[PDB]
Amino acid sequence: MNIFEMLRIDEGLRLKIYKDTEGYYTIGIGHLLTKSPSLNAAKSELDKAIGRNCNGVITKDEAEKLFNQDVDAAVRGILRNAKLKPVYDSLDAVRRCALINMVFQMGETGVAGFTNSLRMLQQKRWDAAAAALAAAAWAAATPNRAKRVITTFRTGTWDAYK
Structure with missing residues (x-):
């Protein structure tokens, strides 16, 4: 990938x-x-x-x-972006890609709303975060992509798309 x-x-x-x-x-x-x-x-x-x-x-x-x-x-x-910039830098190559895929689908303003989620990402709390997303409107909305992207945040590997 x-x-x-x-x-x-x-x-x-x-x-x-x-x-x-x-x-x-x-x-x-x-x-x-x-x-x-x-x-x-x-x-x-x-x-x-x-x-x-x-x-x-x-x-x-x-x-x-x-x-x-x-x-x-x-x-x-x-x-x-003020809210997005910090987390984005704390990210590694691949989970940089998941965020793009997230803004890409629900733009800046939307991604920004994921407060507690971004905190944990930043704090590198890969599972609480995976969790914390799989509870949001979004996964309801686009259950498949939603997942795939959430694995991307879990792992930090191309598993979900390979």
Whole structure:
């Protein structure tokens, strides 16, 4: 693994311009193209984004890159966050990846609400924390991902996704 692979599995990966639940053009692993009801528009932003005559479809590698640029964008945000920054630094490589996957699915503001949870993470209390999450709205909501990510916090290994 790697963070890319862990999202491939959780989000999924689309290689041809598609709409979302919100009906915004997207492409790759949740790379929102533009939010204007125009195909042409998105098709342009796209080409622009990756650079060439893609015409609505990109390579698996082409998507990884965008995906990376968004992790980047998402972490940048995590550091620039007061509540998130501290825990994020106390994390090790792999559980850095679980947090991204968590913000990724329920953004900053949401991840931030996990107070007692973040404390324990920080305090490296890997099981009380696993526990403490498996009691929150979230696991109700997305029981499978929820689990997989919670194992990631338990172990600190790619077991749940390999």
